[PDB]
């Protein structure tokens with residue numbers, strides 16, 4: 232109902248994951264042969280969110 | 281390395297039809313020039329200053 | 331050798347200038363050249379000739395970001411009007427390189443897809459709950475914070491708009507249009523009869539036509 | 549159809565244009581060393597700063 236903030240909480244967790252994308256973006260190698268494990272896990276959690 | 285009484289700087293000259301003119305600009309080959317991704321040249325003068 | 335034949339093979343780091351086309355980035359193909367010649371001599375004093383038609387890539391270390399498609403070298407003769415029979419020579423090697431588009435698919439494209447799907451979800455959320463603007467504007471905030479990753483990763487050149495940038499900007503206007511239309515839906519919902527009377531066209535189209543036309547519904 | 553193709557001030561030479569080609573061109577530009585003159589079949593496009601002429605007659609690109 233109005234006041235539970237179910238969307239608030241879920242979309243704010245998505246926003247936090249979007250900040251962790253920039254943080255990881257600054258660290259991962261820039262080759263293109265395989266996808267790193269950290270970036271694979273980020274894609275997973277953002278799809279679950 | 282030398283003063284103006286010993287070395288004189290000038291601009292180079294060309295010839296069109298027996299006449300001389302000074303080269304008052306930067307030279308750019310129009311065929312071998314790849315333009316910059318952010319900057320286009322508008323003017324490119326040259327000057328001897330005293 | 332005892333006949334006077336000389337073979338010299340020195341190493342070098344070549345930094346070459348290359349016209350880079352970014353129209354199709356990150357799925358772009360580049361043609362990059364290395365132009366070589368004798369600097370102070372003309373073709374009547376020192377002549378050059380390529381050793382083979384194609385560059386030597388027998389000991390080439392695989393890249394990780396680029397794939398070598400083709401490579402070839404060409405020799406040129408150039409004459410000037412001032413000197414009728416003096417040629418100027420140069421060998422030009424070219425390399426056609428295709429980019430491997432995975433780093434940029436996983437780091438810039440998939441998030442944009444996700445944000446577009448979310449931008450569409452907002453229209454199934456009822457206005458009775460007070461969270462339509464929260465949802466819409468939070469999607470927009472996430473996209474604005476992703477802009478920081480786009481600006482960190484994409485090339486900041488102004489030769490053309492890349493394809494990845496066209497997609498980023500399509501997503502931006504898609505989100506903003508969703509937000510505007512959400513504000514018009516919310517305004518149409520809290521509309522007080524005391525001040526606004528429903529017109530005949532609205533009561534005809536949105537009560538007696540579409541409801542019936544709508545099939546996939548309950 | 550028949551066009552000159554020699555470079556700059558080289559001994560005159562000719563070529564035969566491909567079936568259908570009604571044009572003929574003369575491209576001139578200068579660099580640090582001097583003036584280059586290119587001639588051939590067709591009416592091509594050219595980067596800005598280069599002189600270009602096109603002619604639909606016969607051996608008229610000299």
Ligand SMILES: *[C@@H]1O[C@H](CO)[C@@H](O[C@@H]2O[C@H](CO)[C@@H](O[C@@H]3O[C@H](CO[C@H]4O[C@H](CO[C@H]5O[C@H](CO)[C@@H](O)[C@H](O)[C@@H]5O[C@H]5O[C@H](CO)[C@@H](O)[C@H](O)[C@@H]5O)[C@@H](O)[C@H](O[C@H]5O[C@H](CO)[C@@H](O)[C@H](O)[C@@H]5O)[C@@H]4O)[C@@H](O)[C@H](O[C@H]4O[C@H](CO)[C@@H](O)[C@H](O)[C@@H]4O[C@H]4O[C@H](CO)[C@@H](O)[C@H](O)[C@@H]4O)[C@@H]3O)[C@H](O)[C@H]2NC(C)=O)[C@H](O)[C@H]1NC(C)=O
Nearest residue numbers: 361363404405406407408422424553554555585586587588
């Ligand atoms: C990626 O980017 C790359 C870089 O941008 C790009 O590379 C380019 O690729 C193309 C091919 O796709 C290249 O084009 C080829 O270039 C060859 C070399 O051209 C130069 O040399 C010519 C020959 O010069 C000798 O012969 C003349 C007489 O014929 C004399 O006048 C000369 O003085 C010279 O004589 C000397 O040698 C003689 C024999 O060796 C000897 O007898 C003599 O005594 C003396 O020692 C020049 O003619 C030529 O100059 C022309 O072109 C320039 C512009 O480049 C003009 O400004 C000039 O005014 C002049 O017109 C060059 O200096 C060419 O040989 C080759 O031409 C042949 O194929 C084309 C195909 O279109 C024909 O039109 C042409 O008639 C030729 O026909 C050939 O047909 C078949 C083979 O196909 C064969 O049977 C026939 O006999 C003949 O050989 C061609 O144009 C281009 O050079 C590359 N540019 C570079 C490297 O910068 C690459 O494509 C890109 N990749 C992509 C996009 O995929």
